[PDB]
């Protein structure tokens, strides 16, 4: 599958893509304002995720740090990326069908559209002012607003024991962005897709 992303922010980002214990394609890239990057993602993967990098430096190696969205200090990521982080998540080939959604579940960072570039089904997309109305306490020092969770590790914003329910926190979120997930048990926002589509994240789409 084909996933193309595209950077519409004023800013540069450096894009990432992981399955958790692998990259997919290059693991990640400088994307600069306008500035587009086609991966291909094999089928079949599972618990694949996209996301965006803020204020990063890499040497020479690869090797450095980003403000938001870290993967172990890696240009070309490998793991998941460090709160916060808006996600565009998937699971390709799963009994015929794709599965696509945003989560704001690891917080938020970037503004997201992630949709179809095939026929079959529709987009979804999380581009409301979440850093600027950000809750006090939510509020990541080096940029974004982080989710509950990162910030007060509790059994209800972590959902640890599988019975929480939606909480001031999260309804933050939901407000904002009714179309990306805002804590684990939401009422799930994933879009069924045809199998093997292909797809276009574009940061800060309404830019």
């Given at each position: 599958?084909?996933?193309?992303?595209?950077?519409?922010?004023?800013?540069?980002?450096?894009?990432?893509?992981?399955?958790?214990?692998?990259?997919?394609?290059?693991?990640?890239?400088?994307?600069?304002?306008?500035?587009?990057?086609?991966?291909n993602?094999?089928?079949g993967?599972?618990?694949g995720?996209?996301?965006?990098?803020?204020d990063?430096?890499?040497?020479?190696?690869?090797?450095?740090?980003?403000?938001?969205?870290?993967?172990?200090?890696?240009?070309?990521?490998?793991?998941?990326?460090?709160?916060?982080?808006?996600?565009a998540?998937?699971?390709?080939?799963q009994?015929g069908?794709?599965?696509?959604?945003?989560?704001?579940?690891?917080?938020?960072?970037?503004?997201?559209?992630?949709?179809?570039?095939?026929?079959?089904?529709?987009?979804?997309?999380?581009?409301?002012?979440?850093?600027?109305?950000?809750?006090?306490?939510?509020?990541?020092p080096?940029?974004?607003?982080?989710?509950?969770?990162?910030?007060?590790?509790?059994?209800?914003?972590?959902?640890?024991?599988?019975?929480?329910?939606?909480?001031?926190?999260?309804?933050?979120?939901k407000?904002?962005?009714?179309?990306?997930?805002?804590?684990?048990?939401?009422?799930?926002?994933?879009?069924?897709?045809?199998?093997?589509?292909?797809?276009?994240?574009?940061?800060?789409?309404?830019a």
């Amino acid at each position: 599958a084909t996933f193309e992303i595209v950077n519409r922010c004023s800013y540069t980002v450096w894009a990432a893509a992981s399955k958790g214990d692998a990259a997919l394609d290059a693991g990640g890239r400088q994307l600069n304002s306008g500035e587009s990057w086609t991966i291909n993602v094999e089928p079949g993967t599972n618990g694949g995720k996209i996301w965006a990098r803020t204020d990063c430096y890499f040497d020479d190696s690869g090797s450095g740090i980003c403000k938001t969205g870290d993967c172990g200090g890696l240009l070309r990521c490998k793991r998941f990326g460090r709160p916060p982080t808006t996600l565009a998540e998937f699971s390709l080939n799963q009994y015929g069908k794709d599965y696509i959604d945003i989560s704001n579940i690891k917080g938020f960072n970037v503004p997201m559209n992630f949709s179809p570039t095939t026929r079959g089904c529709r987009g979804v997309r999380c581009a409301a002012d979440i850093v600027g109305q950000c809750p006090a306490k939510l509020k990541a020092p080096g940029g974004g607003c982080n989710d509950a969770c990162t910030v007060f590790q509790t059994s209800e914003y972590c959902c640890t024991t599988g019975k929480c329910g939606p909480t001031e926190y999260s309804r933050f979120f939901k407000r904002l962005c009714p179309d990306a997930f805002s804590y684990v048990l939401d009422k799930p926002t994933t879009v069924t897709c045809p199998g093997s589509s292909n797809y276009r994240v574009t940061f800060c789409p309404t830019a």
